């Protein structure tokens, strides 16, 4: 399916690349500090592992649905053949960038001074259980080539890992950047739905729908706590 309105298509591209930038720029400050220090002391090792799980899972869904004519046909067979694919180029760019950045972090953890830091049993357990389940789903889908079903599991895994990021977490510049990308990724989906006259993209990409809303709600909650509720 193609865009109807020229201004709505341009709006959707501008809000998408704003979402890409506000969420990709935050990877560099820690990475630069770690290389200069030649150490990872101060970094949460559990969070690095949980984020590699989340970013690889979202990346699988975005790259596959964006580039595979085969998986795109499965999408059309499920939500409608007049539907627009709900994965934008900025989603693909965000995902690949977030995996490379997280992989650089892991390489830094491996080469650099670690101090008394170590991934917790509870975090290793979450990751092992999540990866095991994903491997169970890869083998169930492999004979029937159920690739839309498989990457929708990968997308639900990122929604689980997104809940793990915010729920325990419950200064302003980083919150504002995170909130901007959540609102920009949500608004992107709205603009698409308005133009196509269809809300199916919210169901076909329930991972992006929840990733954006979990981010918005939780960042609003943190801003409400640091300024209204207590100080």
């Amino acid at each position, epitope marked *: 399916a193609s865009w109807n309105s020229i201004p709505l298509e341009i709006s959707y591209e501008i809000v998408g690349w704003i979402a890409f930038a506000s969420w990709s720029i935050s990877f560099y400050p820690q990475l630069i500090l770690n290389f200069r220090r030649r150490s990872v002391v*101060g970094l949460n*090792f*559990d969070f690095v592992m949980l984020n590699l799980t989340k970013h690889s899972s979202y990346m699988i869904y975005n790259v596959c649905l964006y580039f595979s004519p085969v998986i795109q046909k499965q999408y059309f067979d499920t939500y409608g053949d007049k539907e627009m694919i709900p994965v934008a180029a900025n989603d693909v760019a965000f995902s690949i960038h977030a995996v490379v950045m997280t992989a650089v972090t892991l390489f830094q953890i491996f080469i650099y*001074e670690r101090g*008394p*830091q*170590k991934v*917790s049993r509870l*975090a290793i357990g979450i990751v092992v259980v999540v990866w095991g389940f994903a491997a169970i789903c890869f083998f169930i889908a492999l004979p029937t080539h159920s690739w839309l079903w498989l990457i929708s599991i990968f997308n639900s895994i990122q929604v689980f890992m997104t809940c793990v990021k915010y729920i325990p977490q419950a200064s302003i510049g980083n919150i504002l950047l995170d909130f901007t990308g959540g609102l920009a990724n949500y608004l992107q989906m709205v603009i698409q739905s308005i133009d196509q006259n269809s809300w199916k993209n919210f169901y076909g990409n329930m991972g992006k729908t929840l990733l954006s809303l979990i981010s918005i709600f939780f960042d609003i909650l943190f801003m409400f706590q640091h300024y209204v509720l207590y100080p």
Partner: nanobody, 122 residues
């Protein structure tokens, strides 16, 4: 869990010097700070010095600035307190402190040992 064991101290004369040691044992997901607190008899805790683990920044109480120095070994296994130009007001039980998170799910936790006595008198 984190185990902290304090060494050094005892008595010193005004103007004298003492070096404190804290052996760090165990592991966390994230080390936040390493420091020293002290409690004079019947008083409250007083942070003496602290190293911020994310930046390597050293911070001190105003009453000890220029006389006391916090330091560590390369592997963050030991933290030191070089107590120079000792004053009677420096008499207290000194406690080595470490702040860090056991996991992502449990916030930062504060660990301290049983402490070492430092008494300064003529």
């Amino acid at each position: 869990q984190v185990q902290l064991v304090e060494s050094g101290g005892g008595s010193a004369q005004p103007g004298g010097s003492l070096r404190l040691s804290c052996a760090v044992s165990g592991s966390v997901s994230e080390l936040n700070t390493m420091g020293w607190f002290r409690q004079a008899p019947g008083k409250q805790r007083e942070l003496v010095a602290r190293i911020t683990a994310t930046s390597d920044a050293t911070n001190y109480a105003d009453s000890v600035k220029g006389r006391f120095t916090i330091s560590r070994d390369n592997g963050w296994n030991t933290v030191y307190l070089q107590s120079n130009s000792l004053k009677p007001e420096d008499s207290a039980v000194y406690y080595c402190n470490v702040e860090g998170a056991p996991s992502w799910f449990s916030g930062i936790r504060s660990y301290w040992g049983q402490g070492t006595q430092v008494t300064v008198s003529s």
